[PDB]
Design a protein around this ligand. Sequence first.
Ligand SMILES: [Zn+2]
Ligand SMILES: [Zn+2]
Length: 639
Amino acid sequence: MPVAHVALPVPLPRTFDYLLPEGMTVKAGCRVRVPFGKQQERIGIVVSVSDASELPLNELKAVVEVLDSEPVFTHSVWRLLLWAADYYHHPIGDVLFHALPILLRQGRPAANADWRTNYAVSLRLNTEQATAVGAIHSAADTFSAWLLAGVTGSGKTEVYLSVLENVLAQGKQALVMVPEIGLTPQTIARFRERFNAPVEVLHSGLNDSERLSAWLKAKNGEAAIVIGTRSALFTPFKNLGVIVIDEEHDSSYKQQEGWRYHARDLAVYRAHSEQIPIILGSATPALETLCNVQQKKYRLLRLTRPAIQHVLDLKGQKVQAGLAPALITRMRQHLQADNQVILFLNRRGFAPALLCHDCGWIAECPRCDHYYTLHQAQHHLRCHHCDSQRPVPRQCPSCGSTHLVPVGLGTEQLEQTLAPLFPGVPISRIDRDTTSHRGGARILIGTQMLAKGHHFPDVTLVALLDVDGALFSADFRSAERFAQLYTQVAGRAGRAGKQGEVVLQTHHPEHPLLQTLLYKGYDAFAEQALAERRMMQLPPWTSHVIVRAEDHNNQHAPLFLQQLRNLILSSPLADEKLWVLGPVPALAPKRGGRWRWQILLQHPSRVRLQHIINGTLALINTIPDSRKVKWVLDVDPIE
Ligand SMILES: [Zn+2]
Ligand SMILES: [Zn+2]
């Protein structure tokens, strides 16, 4: 009598044991229908089969039905999901079901209702592009990870297409991932045209039957290329030969609710498991990717080859609605010409800092010298790093001025205060934030990078009002995000024959990172920022895990996190290189009627930190408050 160890779609980090009735057989990765709870039945996925259970066998119930004779996961996806459930510390049943098409989550048959033998290659690459294609061509049957770095217009997409052509010429399949925002009509029609082979485009418009039909075609070899967003990483393939991740830095590859996986990292694990090349492409590569190049874990392939810009010093200026006087003037010049203007601000929920508008002084924690977070309503400064607290001072202590201003505020009523300064001028946001156009003069308000397929040809002035927020944020990654945005808009501004203008406002135009970025470029900024991350022992040079908790009384969550902190620190694996910081309020400390708190775990070794967390979680029942609180583990947070 075998025992099936079954994963169910429930938020418990365990499997559930069932007996197989005589005559019924099943294997790992097959779905089953099983009893669950008092008198309910659910679909589960068999994780393994053995002849034993931790419970007495006479306490086990029987599997009702086996749904699959062949598994619904290929090996490499199965190995990736089991590895990820452990590394992200997420319930195995939630991981496995989240990776399936909806119809298969529901228990329906994995069924509905070639190009290989005769592949026809249907173009002049430059030297640099041919070197890149050739390097991946020679690397085709073992694992290797490549950063393809080149500004927009340097020909990355043509390298991708030639690599794919070579992969299809081998009779192998390909996976192409693009950001959520990336599946444009032009992009898609481009791919489909180049390949005389079936291409499946997993775009968010697809209904569940079409998503299953594409899954089946990739699994059985009928589709040559699957193009999709972060979840396409779970696509089964018969014979996968390459993975391409376009725009590898984009934050849409990190899932930030439920299972918080990072598709970029999991795609590299998948390439290592399938023993194939993965190409990560970007005009503004993430620091962790540049760190992987410097450490020789990734290989670099570089592709190489005019807007007016002004940096405005805010110090002592008579601002109107957070806009420098000289910027207001420029905006009037462009608006009078019937052109459009984009203002970029920090993201809503940004945790503001406090600085002197006259001399530039920034409020800093005296204990640990990190920049303070300003809480205006409560007239408090609070340190996100060490949790110290001070009243807001009446005077700058460096110069004596009373003109202390918050930095990093979003479009807080700014729509209302911009209408006075620009009467009769329509105002409109452009952020994809729609709670889950083409004309003359207009002011556009943005808070993040535009999509690669998202252009506003009638914009001739971009203003960056997010500089101070980025530089003096309590989030160490904000400068990196700002550098990536700046490089995009500067590149987009007046690509040719359309004179563009970019204006940056800051109280610190001389800031050394900003100077490197503006006059030496992204790559130089990135080398400098990476060196500073290393000195500070921050990601990508150490590993971080944030434990986030919330409550309805501003007491349960910090108490639970204090206790979790002590339990972590008491781990037999906890050494001198482990830091556990906090508890501290989240950078958005309260949303709804909930208080949000966190601790940060930091270690140089990703695997050691994983083992420390594993030992802590095996003892989580030692902290009974763990069930009085909603809490999650966020491994490798992008915060
Ligand atoms: Zn501090
Ligand atoms: Zn001052």
